[PDB]
Amino acid sequence: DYEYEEITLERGNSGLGFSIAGGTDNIGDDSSIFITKIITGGAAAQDGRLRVNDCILRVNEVDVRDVTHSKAVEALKEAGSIVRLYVKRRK
Amino acid sequence: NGTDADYEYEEITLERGNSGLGFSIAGGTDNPHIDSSIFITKIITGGAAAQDGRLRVNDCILRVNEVDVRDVTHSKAVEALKEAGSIVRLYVKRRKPV
Amino acid sequence: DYEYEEITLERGNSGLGFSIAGGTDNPHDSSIFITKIITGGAAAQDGRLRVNDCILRVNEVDVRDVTHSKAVEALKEAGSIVRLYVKRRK
Amino acid sequence: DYEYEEITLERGNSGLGFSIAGGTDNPHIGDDSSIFITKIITGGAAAQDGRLRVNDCILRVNEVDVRDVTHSKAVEALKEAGSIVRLYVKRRK
Amino acid sequence: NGTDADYEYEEITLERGNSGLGFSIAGGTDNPHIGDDSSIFITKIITGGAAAQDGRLRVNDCILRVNEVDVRDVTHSKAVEALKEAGSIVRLYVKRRK
Amino acid sequence: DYEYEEITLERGNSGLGFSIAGGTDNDSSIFITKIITGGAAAQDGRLRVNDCILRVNEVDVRDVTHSKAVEALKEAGSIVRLYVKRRKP
Amino acid sequence: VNGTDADYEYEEITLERGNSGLGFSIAGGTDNPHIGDDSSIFITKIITGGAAAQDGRLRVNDCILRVNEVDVRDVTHSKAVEALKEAGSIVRLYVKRRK
Amino acid sequence: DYEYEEITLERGNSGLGFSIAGGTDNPHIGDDSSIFITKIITGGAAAQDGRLRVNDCILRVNEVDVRDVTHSKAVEALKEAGSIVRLYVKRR
Amino acid sequence: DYEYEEITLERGNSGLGFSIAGGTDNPHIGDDSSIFITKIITGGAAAQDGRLRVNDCILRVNEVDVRDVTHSKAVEALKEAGSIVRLYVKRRK
Amino acid sequence: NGTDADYEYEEITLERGNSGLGFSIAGGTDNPHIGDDSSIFITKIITGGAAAQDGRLRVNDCILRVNEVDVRDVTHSKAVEALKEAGSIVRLYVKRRKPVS
Amino acid sequence: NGTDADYEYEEITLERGNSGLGFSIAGGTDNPHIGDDSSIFITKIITGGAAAQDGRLRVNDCILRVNEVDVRDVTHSKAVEALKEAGSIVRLYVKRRKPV
Amino acid sequence: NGTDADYEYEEITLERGNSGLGFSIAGGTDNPHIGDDSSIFITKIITGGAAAQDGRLRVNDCILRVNEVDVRDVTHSKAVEALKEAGSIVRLYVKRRK
Amino acid sequence: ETEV
Amino acid sequence: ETEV
Amino acid sequence: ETEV
Amino acid sequence: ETEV
Amino acid sequence: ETEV
Amino acid sequence: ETEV
Amino acid sequence: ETEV
Amino acid sequence: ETEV
Amino acid sequence: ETEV
Amino acid sequence: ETEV
Amino acid sequence: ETEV
Amino acid sequence: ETEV
């Protein structure tokens, strides 16, 4: 009852083009890192695959299933210009 | 769902003039502009918002002094601005460029 | 002449902690001035404001020539951290 | 509306003893950039002092206005506030 | 209200033994164990059992997930179900006070 | 003589993308019998047919029934660590 | 046609050559038609661990229509092999498959 | 600090109309194996499109990642990109 | 890196039982106004409590901030702190 | 062998702007500014910058510590680093000559 | 003038442990490790630390860049501070001599 | 401690050229090169020199012995003196990582 | 829309 | 006179 | 409570 | 065999 | 939430 | 959140 | 069939 | 360099 | 110094 | 002289 | 040297 | 370091 997707984004001037919430130290009742917003015109919205409330499992090879919010934010800041996102959604 | 924007927030304190605060608003729970927020649709020439120079069309008014207007009826928003007195603290947000 | 000062108060439960009189609409000049400083209040703990201090600006609102209630409303809506520009007789 | 308090903490070995969220780049709450207190650590300085409360909004740290700052500037204003830390806060009702 | 502690997160994969997983649970929406808090708490670790031999579970651990099943806001009979229907290899997501 | 490797896979919609055989109820080790075109194991590139699975995360599968190997892989989560060995080519 | 037919997919797939080549096998050509009449080039095998496998997009029975700038819709087996062997480091593949 | 851009070129009769240096076996800069544009040929494709700049660093050519490739490989990624070449670059 | 401790002392017939150096008008260490404990008297109150150490920096005496006072103000804060004196001190870890 | 002055001390907590702290320094062990005094001295206060708007710093002010870092006796590079790496809130401990008539 | 080596480069992203990154560095423009070479060099891999657990870093690896901070030509202190403040995820770019 | 590698050990007999041996050394008790490690290390190999033409020495080779002068626990100058007084034929006992 |  |  |  |  |  |  |  |  |  |  |  |  979960669907998985690997998604590769090209960092833009406004970053990857989405916002995240969650973490062990935090929205949504659990520790998961999840998308809350996809920015019109940004990287994630031009690639077309990421969805609001998608749950980020891995950023490149960094496992973000059990991290603080900042570690996740930093895992994304430091992921390079071509970024492999591994996600799952309730669909 | 829809794609959204990053928002810049700004606090703008206006001094009322004789014609009011000098802007038009649309929106509310009972008539969403789409989202029940209250948006500036118009900045009137010569009014306080125009002279102050800071407000913009499509700015979203989140709070009027101590009155939250993020989830209110259209005539409540109007009333809050009408009776806010001569020094009106506006908390607004606007879509930033991408 | 006049001495000038910039005083930043943090608002308390009893307000900024002083009283003001005057204005252009005052019966019997037209400035906003301090008449009282409340024991235990913000202005008295900050220690800088004085009775008969004339208030010239509240944050960025010019209160030199304003009705009494515009001054009061300027102060009510100045926020939690409040910049007063004042002058007093040297 | 709000109640206002000035609170002076003594830094301890585990810091000031509370956790904060918020800031212009990570709004803890919708459309609000405030620095909110989210945790008072049992036995830490803030708990032992007794006056701070969960969800208190931090307005000023010594003389550093943190009503409209990024999250890390709020963090750094507390990191660098010394050993005797003046907190100006407000809370609902 | 209430002070709080720092929390530790941990994932714990047990292999069920004939007498089950070897612990007891209290909690649920229909019977909160710590009040204003419907979580699932471990209250007993049975000597000889899989949880005890694994050595990592502790009394007062909070069970967040059970394989792919969330039990953060669950009736007591529904969390008893999740653990009982979980198969011979059970991934537990737990958190605890540090 | 054997070579060993650790291989971390990300589960896809069609699972980890390989088939296993063996168990104590079949020698008795769990070995991969095929790698699925387009799947996760195939895109990762490292698992091979006749690879032998020793550990699924921290679950020792060297001496287990077929079905407990299956539940072990089935319940390993999204990011699955496999400790495997193969006959040194 | 006399035969029933499917709907077709049409796909560009750019491979990066690995140590052991492109990582797949082909059959077909004018001198050895894989399916009855079609002289097209078909992928018969995807090597485990190769570039085709790791890329993940090619599939057995894919029909290779183009190799970079080289038309292989109507060539001998040997000429298809050479266009793939000699395609260089980066290999653009225009394939079509049933779906 | 860097600025990013996606640029789409139409191949011309003299190619894409720019020159590149770099790669793991031919570092243009010290300890940097990136692929750098070193020239924009007057009147060529890159010039007329108007968006590429000298010293722009090429990250991706279509979907091929050239951040960490030999020079011959990066040249071949551009030769074999087809007639409409998608380039992902960064600069500053 | 500093360690912080709160130390509460009962005053004896020989005073609090330690010596202090420093102040704004008589700095113990170059360019440093802090109040340093320079010796813990054998048998005295500070000594029997066992928590104060030599070179401890006194930040606060009860509620009086002594990070930046003159020397004799630091002495008069300690002298006039009562029979039960709580010192907030810091030391190098 | 040199005459000195008496020094006023002050602690100035700056908030960093986009252009840094808004002043220039000279000094350090590898390049003393006066005599063999290795002190770090403010030699310029940039109009518009954070130091000028705060108002407290003065030219020739001697900077003793930057947050946790002591810069009384360090090289010019160490001090520069300390200031640049201090983050967005910068506790400066300074001393200046108290003028004599 | 000295002979030199051919160099292999690698990008190694560490996750910070409670004890930091788990390695020691020598060098800097203010203290070159090998003559007139100001590069930052790994001198030790701490047992139990993140560098050792990740497995890829090597003693004598030259660190060229730490996340977005270039450390090829900096003082020892700037290098140290760049590593200490890189956060919980540290992208390292290193080079090592390949043997002959 | 730290983690370690495996070490090769090697005899290397250099024939002193006109410009000496043709390499440079760091280390020694009064100036360790690696933390808490007094061994002598080669930090430079001179182009054209005897060490370069011989081809076997490497940068970061630790020199354990210079004919029969042990230089495992020496001052810098004392190891430097063993290499100037070693004559035209110099047996080096060295070890290197991996 | 309302004018205020 | 107004309290503020 | 319930034994599992 | 079993698919996983 | 944090923009990334 | 951040502990302070 | 040929392997490429 | 290479003209592309 | 002073004894206290 | 260094600007900071 | 420095331990980081 | 020293040249030998």
Instruction: Decide if B56 contacts B27 (C-beta within 8 A).
Output: no
Radius of gyration of chain R (CA): 4
Between chain H and chain K, the number of residue pairs with CB atoms below 8 A apart is 9
Which of D62, D70, D73 lies at the smallest CB-CB distance from J13? D62
Q: Quick one: which of E50, E51, E53, E31 has its CA closest to E40?
A: E31
H33 with K95: Cβ contact below 8 A: no
Report the C-alpha gap between I64 and L32 in whole angstroms: 50
CA angle D50, D55, D56 (to 5 degrees): 60
Residue E34, both tokens:
């710590």
Give kind and range of the element (H or E) at residue C45: helix C42-46
Per DSSP, the three-state class of I79 is: helix
> Cβ neighbours of residue C40 under 8 Å, at least 6 residues apart?
C14, C17
User: How does DSSP classify residue J34?
Assistant: B
J67 with D80: Cβ contact below 8 A: yes
Report the C-alpha gap between J57 and J44 in whole angstroms: 10
Burial class of residue F3 (count of CB atoms within 10 Å of its CB; 0-12, 13-18, 19+): exposed
Total residue length of chain D: 93
Q3 with A21: Cβ contact below 8 A: no
Q: Quick one: which of D59, B10, D56, D73 has its CA closest to C81?
A: D59
Residue reference for tokens 């992203």: K13
Report the C-alpha gap between A21 and D28 in whole angstroms: 10
* Interchain contact K/W (3 or more Cβ pairs less than 8 Å): yes
Q: Which residue of N has its CA nearest to C37?
A: N3
K30 with J77: Cβ contact below 8 A: yes
Residue I52, both tokens:
């104060």
Say if D60 is an interface residue toward chain C (CB within 8 Å). Answer: yes
Report the C-alpha gap between A37 and B4 in whole angstroms: 6
> Cβ neighbours of residue A80 under 8 Å, at least 6 residues apart?
A11, A60, K91
The sign of the torsion formed by the CA atoms of A55, A60, A62, A68 equals negative
Report the C-alpha gap between K12 and K67 in whole angstroms: 10
Per DSSP, the three-state class of J2 is: coil
B contacts of D33 (beta carbons < 8 Å): 9
Backbone φ and ψ of H36, nearest 5°: -110, 140
Give how far Cα K90 sits from Cα of A79, I80, J85, K9, Å: 10, 53, 18, 16
Taking residue H35's Cβ as centre, other Cβ atoms within 10 Å add up to 28
Beta bridge partners of G97: G9
Best of A36, A38, A40, A90 to substitute, by most chain B Cβ atoms within 10 angstroms, is: A40
Instruction: Decide if H58 contacts H87 (C-beta within 8 A).
Output: yes
Q: Which residue of J has its CA nearest to D78?
A: J89
Report the C-alpha gap between B60 and B62 in whole angstroms: 6
Report the C-alpha gap between D89 and D5 in whole angstroms: 5
**Encoded amino acid at I51, one letter:** R
Residue reference for tokens 């010394």: D82
User: How does DSSP classify residue K22?
Assistant: S
Taking residue B41's Cβ as centre, other Cβ atoms within 10 Å add up to 17
Give how far Cα L55 sits from Cα of L13, L15, L25, L42, Å: 11, 12, 17, 14
The sign of the torsion formed by the CA atoms of D64, D67, D73, D78 equals positive
Set out the domains of chain H in order of their start, with CATH numbers.
2-92 (2.30.42.10)
Report the C-alpha gap between A71 and A26 in whole angstroms: 13
M4 with B44: Cβ contact below 8 A: no
Residue K7, both tokens:
């160099």
Beta bridge partners of B61: B38, B92
Report the C-alpha gap between I87 and I89 in whole angstroms: 6
Instruction: Decide if H45 contacts A68 (C-beta within 8 A).
Output: no
User: How does DSSP classify residue K80?
Assistant: H
CA-based end-to-end distance of chain H: 6
Residue reference for tokens 């790669």: H23
Report the C-alpha gap between H63 and H65 in whole angstroms: 6
Say if D90 is an interface residue toward chain C (CB within 8 Å). Answer: yes
User: How does DSSP classify residue H13?
Assistant: T
User: What resolution does the deposited structure have, in angstroms?
Assistant: 2.1
Report the C-alpha gap between A20 and B21 in whole angstroms: 37
Q: Which residue of D has its CA nearest to C42?
A: D6
Closest CA of chain G from F38, distance in Å: 5
Report the C-alpha gap between L60 and L98 in whole angstroms: 12
Backbone φ and ψ of F40, nearest 5°: -75, -45
CA-based end-to-end distance of chain O: 10
Backbone φ and ψ of C42, nearest 5°: -60, -50
Give kind and range of the element (H or E) at residue E27: strand E23-27
Report the C-alpha gap between D48 and D50 in whole angstroms: 5
Helices in chain H by DSSP H: which ranges?
45-49, 71-79
Technique of determination = X-ray
CA angle H19, H22, H24 (to 5 degrees): 150
Strand pairing class (C54-58; C61-62): antiparallel
* Interchain contact I/M (3 or more Cβ pairs less than 8 Å): no
User: How does DSSP classify residue K99?
Assistant: P
Beta bridge partners of D89: D5, D58
Instruction: Decide if B69 contacts B80 (C-beta within 8 A).
Output: yes
**Encoded amino acid at F85, one letter:** K
Say if C81 is an interface residue toward chain D (CB within 8 Å). Answer: yes
D63 with J13: Cβ contact below 8 A: yes
Q: Find the helix packing angle between J76-84 and K76-84, rounded to 10°.
A: 20
Say if A52 is an interface residue toward chain H (CB within 8 Å). Answer: no
Residue L45, both tokens:
């190999």
Report the C-alpha gap between D17 and I4 in whole angstroms: 13
Report the C-alpha gap between C18 and C33 in whole angstroms: 10
Report the C-alpha gap between F5 and I54 in whole angstroms: 57
Instruction: Decide if J16 contacts J66 (C-beta within 8 A).
Output: no
Q: Quick one: which of L96, L71, L95 has its CA closest to L84?
A: L71
Best of B86, B88, B90 to substitute, by most chain C Cβ atoms within 10 angstroms, is: B86
B41 with M3: Cβ contact below 8 A: no
Beta bridge partners of D43: none
Report the C-alpha gap between E82 and E67 in whole angstroms: 8
Per DSSP, the three-state class of D71 is: helix
Q: Which residue of F has its CA nearest to A88?
A: F78
**Encoded amino acid at C9, one letter:** L
Total residue length of chain I: 93
Taking residue E90's Cβ as centre, other Cβ atoms within 10 Å add up to 22
Q: DSSP states of chain A as a string? A: --EEEEEEEE-BTTBTSEEEEE-TT---SSS-EEEEEEBTTSHHHHH----TT-EEEEETTEE-SS--HHHHHHHHHTS-SEEEEEEEE--
CA-based end-to-end distance of chain J: 21
**Left, alpha or beta for H38 (phi > 0: left; psi -120 to 50: alpha)?**
alpha
Report the C-alpha gap between J27 and A62 in whole angstroms: 45
Q: Quick one: which of A89, A91, A26 has its CA closest to A53?
A: A89
Helices in L7-90 by DSSP H: which ranges?
50-54, 76-84
Residue B87, both tokens:
């020094």
Per DSSP, the three-state class of D74 is: helix
**Encoded amino acid at B52, one letter:** D
N3 with C19: Cβ contact below 8 A: yes
Q: Quick one: which of K62, K85, H67, H7 has its CA closest to A80?
A: H67
**Left, alpha or beta for D82 (phi > 0: left; psi -120 to 50: alpha)?**
left
Helix then strand then coil, % of chain M, to nearest 5: 0, 50, 50
Give kind and range of the element (H or E) at residue G84: helix G77-85
Say if E87 is an interface residue toward chain F (CB within 8 Å). Answer: yes
Q: With helix as H, strand as E and coil as C, how does G3-58 read?
A: CCCCCEEEEEEEEECECCECCEEEEECCCCCCECCECCEEEEEECCCCHHHHHCCC
> Cβ neighbours of residue K95 under 8 Å, at least 6 residues apart?
H31, K7, K8, K9, K10, K61, K62, K64
Burial class of residue K83 (count of CB atoms within 10 Å of its CB; 0-12, 13-18, 19+): buried
Chains interfacing with E (3 or more CB pairs < 8 Å): A, D, F, O
Side-chain half-sphere exposure of D53, counting CA atoms within 13 A: 12
Instruction: Decide if L90 contacts L14 (C-beta within 8 A).
Output: yes
Say if I3 is an interface residue toward chain D (CB within 8 Å). Answer: yes
